Write an enzyme that holds these catalytic residues in place. Sequence first.
Site, PDB file in Angstrom:
ATOM      1  N   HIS A 197      -3.480   4.125   5.402  1.00  0.00           N
ATOM      2  CA  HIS A 197      -3.407   4.124   3.933  1.00  0.00           C
ATOM      3  C   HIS A 197      -3.757   5.486   3.373  1.00  0.00           C
ATOM      4  O   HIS A 197      -4.579   6.203   3.911  1.00  0.00           O
ATOM      5  CB  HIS A 197      -4.328   3.069   3.318  1.00  0.00           C
ATOM      6  CG  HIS A 197      -4.022   1.677   3.775  1.00  0.00           C
ATOM      7  ND1 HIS A 197      -4.790   0.592   3.419  1.00  0.00           N
ATOM      8  CD2 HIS A 197      -3.024   1.194   4.554  1.00  0.00           C
ATOM      9  CE1 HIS A 197      -4.296  -0.495   3.984  1.00  0.00           C
ATOM     10  NE2 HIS A 197      -3.233  -0.162   4.677  1.00  0.00           N
ATOM     11  N   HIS A 241       0.786  -1.219   0.000  1.00  0.00           N
ATOM     12  CA  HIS A 241       0.000   0.000   0.000  1.00  0.00           C
ATOM     13  C   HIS A 241       0.819   1.270   0.000  1.00  0.00           C
ATOM     14  O   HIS A 241       1.893   1.296   0.554  1.00  0.00           O
ATOM     15  CB  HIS A 241      -0.882   0.118   1.238  1.00  0.00           C
ATOM     16  CG  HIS A 241      -1.517  -1.163   1.654  1.00  0.00           C
ATOM     17  ND1 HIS A 241      -1.101  -1.830   2.779  1.00  0.00           N
ATOM     18  CD2 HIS A 241      -2.492  -1.915   1.094  1.00  0.00           C
ATOM     19  CE1 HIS A 241      -1.764  -2.970   2.875  1.00  0.00           C
ATOM     20  NE2 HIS A 241      -2.627  -3.040   1.885  1.00  0.00           N
ATOM     21  N   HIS A 256       3.808  -5.281   3.858  1.00  0.00           N
ATOM     22  CA  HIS A 256       3.307  -5.706   5.181  1.00  0.00           C
ATOM     23  C   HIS A 256       3.637  -7.191   5.510  1.00  0.00           C
ATOM     24  O   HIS A 256       3.986  -7.995   4.632  1.00  0.00           O
ATOM     25  CB  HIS A 256       1.798  -5.483   5.254  1.00  0.00           C
ATOM     26  CG  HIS A 256       1.412  -4.058   5.414  1.00  0.00           C
ATOM     27  ND1 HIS A 256       1.140  -3.503   6.657  1.00  0.00           N
ATOM     28  CD2 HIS A 256       1.270  -3.063   4.507  1.00  0.00           C
ATOM     29  CE1 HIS A 256       0.839  -2.223   6.491  1.00  0.00           C
ATOM     30  NE2 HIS A 256       0.894  -1.934   5.197  1.00  0.00           N
ATOM     31  N   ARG A 297       4.605  -3.651   9.471  1.00  0.00           N
ATOM     32  CA  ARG A 297       5.269  -3.054   8.338  1.00  0.00           C
ATOM     33  C   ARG A 297       6.682  -3.554   8.260  1.00  0.00           C
ATOM     34  O   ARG A 297       7.536  -3.168   9.043  1.00  0.00           O
ATOM     35  CB  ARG A 297       5.211  -1.545   8.450  1.00  0.00           C
ATOM     36  CG  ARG A 297       3.793  -1.062   8.617  1.00  0.00           C
ATOM     37  CD  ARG A 297       3.660   0.420   8.890  1.00  0.00           C
ATOM     38  NE  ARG A 297       2.244   0.692   9.134  1.00  0.00           N
ATOM     39  CZ  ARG A 297       1.667   1.894   9.084  1.00  0.00           C
ATOM     40  NH1 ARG A 297       2.382   2.989   8.781  1.00  0.00           N
ATOM     41  NH2 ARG A 297       0.378   1.977   9.302  1.00  0.00           N
ATOM     42  N   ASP A 313      -4.454   1.622  -2.203  1.00  0.00           N
ATOM     43  CA  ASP A 313      -4.671   0.197  -2.068  1.00  0.00           C
ATOM     44  C   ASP A 313      -4.179  -0.526  -3.332  1.00  0.00           C
ATOM     45  O   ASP A 313      -4.876  -0.639  -4.325  1.00  0.00           O
ATOM     46  CB  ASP A 313      -6.153  -0.092  -1.815  1.00  0.00           C
ATOM     47  CG  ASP A 313      -6.583   0.258  -0.430  1.00  0.00           C
ATOM     48  OD1 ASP A 313      -5.710   0.430   0.457  1.00  0.00           O
ATOM     49  OD2 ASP A 313      -7.821   0.311  -0.186  1.00  0.00           O
ATOM     50  N   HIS A 328       0.796   4.577   1.917  1.00  0.00           N
ATOM     51  CA  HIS A 328       0.286   5.208   3.136  1.00  0.00           C
ATOM     52  C   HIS A 328       0.292   6.720   2.970  1.00  0.00           C
ATOM     53  O   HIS A 328       0.908   7.265   2.045  1.00  0.00           O
ATOM     54  CB  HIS A 328       1.111   4.722   4.345  1.00  0.00           C
ATOM     55  CG  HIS A 328       0.844   3.288   4.681  1.00  0.00           C
ATOM     56  ND1 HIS A 328       0.291   2.899   5.882  1.00  0.00           N
ATOM     57  CD2 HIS A 328       1.025   2.149   3.967  1.00  0.00           C
ATOM     58  CE1 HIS A 328       0.165   1.573   5.900  1.00  0.00           C
ATOM     59  NE2 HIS A 328       0.583   1.095   4.751  1.00  0.00           N
ATOM     60  N   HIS A 372      -9.226   2.640  -1.007  1.00  0.00           N
ATOM     61  CA  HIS A 372      -8.314   3.754  -0.812  1.00  0.00           C
ATOM     62  C   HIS A 372      -7.502   3.991  -2.065  1.00  0.00           C
ATOM     63  O   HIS A 372      -7.139   3.018  -2.723  1.00  0.00           O
ATOM     64  CB  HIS A 372      -7.342   3.452   0.322  1.00  0.00           C
ATOM     65  CG  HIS A 372      -8.010   3.146   1.634  1.00  0.00           C
ATOM     66  ND1 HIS A 372      -7.517   2.256   2.580  1.00  0.00           N
ATOM     67  CD2 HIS A 372      -9.139   3.670   2.157  1.00  0.00           C
ATOM     68  CE1 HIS A 372      -8.309   2.280   3.640  1.00  0.00           C
ATOM     69  NE2 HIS A 372      -9.301   3.125   3.408  1.00  0.00           N
ATOM     70  N   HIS A 426     -11.334   0.539   2.939  1.00  0.00           N
ATOM     71  CA  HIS A 426     -10.247  -0.246   2.367  1.00  0.00           C
ATOM     72  C   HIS A 426     -10.789  -1.263   1.378  1.00  0.00           C
ATOM     73  O   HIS A 426     -11.845  -1.872   1.630  1.00  0.00           O
ATOM     74  CB  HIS A 426      -9.496  -0.942   3.472  1.00  0.00           C
ATOM     75  CG  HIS A 426      -8.370  -1.817   2.977  1.00  0.00           C
ATOM     76  ND1 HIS A 426      -7.200  -1.310   2.439  1.00  0.00           N
ATOM     77  CD2 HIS A 426      -8.277  -3.169   2.888  1.00  0.00           C
ATOM     78  CE1 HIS A 426      -6.452  -2.316   2.018  1.00  0.00           C
ATOM     79  NE2 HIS A 426      -7.073  -3.457   2.293  1.00  0.00           N
TER      80      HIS A 426
HETATM   81 CU   LIG Z   1       0.068  -0.620   4.100  1.00  0.00          CU
HETATM   82 ZN   LIG Z   2      -6.408   0.589   2.253  1.00  0.00          ZN
END
Ligand SMILES: [Cu+2]
Ligand SMILES: [Zn+2]
Lengths: 153, 153
Positions: A63, A46, A120, A143, A83, A48, A80, A71
């Site tokens: 995100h 993602h 992640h 993360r 995403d 962020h 998002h 999400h």
């Molecule tokens: Cu992420």
């Molecule tokens: Zn997201």
Amino acid sequence: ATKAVCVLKGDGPVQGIINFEQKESNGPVKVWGSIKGLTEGLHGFHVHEFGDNTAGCTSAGPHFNPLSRKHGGPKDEERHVGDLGNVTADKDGVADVSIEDSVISLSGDHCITGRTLVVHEKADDLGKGGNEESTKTGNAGSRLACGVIGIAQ
Amino acid sequence: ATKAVCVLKGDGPVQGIINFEQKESNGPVKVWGSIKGLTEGLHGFHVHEFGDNTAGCTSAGPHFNPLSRKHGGPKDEERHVGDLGNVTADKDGVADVSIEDSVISLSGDHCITGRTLVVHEKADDLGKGGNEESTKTGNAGSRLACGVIGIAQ
Ligand SMILES: [Cu+2]
Ligand SMILES: [Zn+2]
Ligand SMILES: CC(C)NC[C@H](O)c1ccc(O)c(O)c1
Ligand SMILES: CC(C)NC[C@H](O)c1ccc(O)c(O)c1
Ligand SMILES: CC(C)NC[C@H](O)c1ccc(O)c(O)c1
Ligand SMILES: CC(C)NC[C@H](O)c1ccc(O)c(O)c1
Ligand SMILES: CC(C)NC[C@H](O)c1ccc(O)c(O)c1
Ligand SMILES: [Cu+2]
Ligand SMILES: [Zn+2]
């Protein structure tokens, strides 16, 4: 074209490099590269909101979500901007990344440059996991590695 | 206000954290933080064009120069947008950074977000060193640490 790049690093074995190119203003963005050091399986992937790595990848916040949506996955209307789904590693610990996305951009309101790309711990359930956290983070966990997306030559 | 941040790291011991705040649109930018692991003295301090750290700090390219000027110091009319002069390390090896600059920005064509902040080996001569290279890099030498400048909360 417009180009950007991100060096992924963290406090463990995960490292990577991700390139971005956008041929037309506000057009689709190609995302490609390689991440190594991963456990076999899916790893959420993602953009962020913040490009802040002061205290590590945690500092990047939630995100990137300029439109205040839940999400989801990259193919969903309800997602998002940040995403990008999952990357998938084999037993070799390597995920080859090759994505095209039309929602992220390297210019405008949905611009990802200066924000943090994160890989992640766990799979992203793409908002289908059944709890409220699914609709925020996809339950993708911690993360592993991250970097700030920068303008490229 | 608009805020940005940069974590500096490199191949050696130099590490830093630098914050940016711009109270008004198009207004001056406050730049503050700390960098440790430096030799005592002056160290060139610049925003470089690209937010690319693929191969380390070299990947960042030349000083950020959207207006096609020669190199100078932060208080000169003739300077690159990225020309933030020198930071100064004491005998603790730490530079206590506190700058206000009226040329860099956190939006628009002078936006430094998504680009690389670099701290250099040696002093920047601010374009007064008497060779051609003074007018390009300030003779500040190698790149000790750098990071991509990111959007902050
Ligand atoms: Cu992420
Ligand atoms: Zn997201
Ligand atoms: C430079 C090559 C390896 N990049 C792929 C190509 O530039 C591209 C493919 C698909 C896209 O949507 C795009 O914007 C750009
Ligand atoms: C906890 C909240 C978000 N409610 C879950 C929601 O009713 C739901 C039910 C069944 C599902 O398969 C699902 O993905 C989501
Ligand atoms: C928290 C402190 C370091 N903030 C500095 C203040 O927001 C500021 C001072 C001078 C400026 O030019 C500016 O844009 C902003
Ligand atoms: C974004 C947060 C986590 N960082 C704040 C920054 O570390 C900071 C805030 C106020 C200060 O006076 C300072 O030197 C530094
Ligand atoms: C830690 C080592 C390098 N000693 C630094 C020394 O105690 C010191 C502390 C504070 C200072 O401002 C300084 O110049 C020098
Ligand atoms: Cu420099
Ligand atoms: Zn310069």
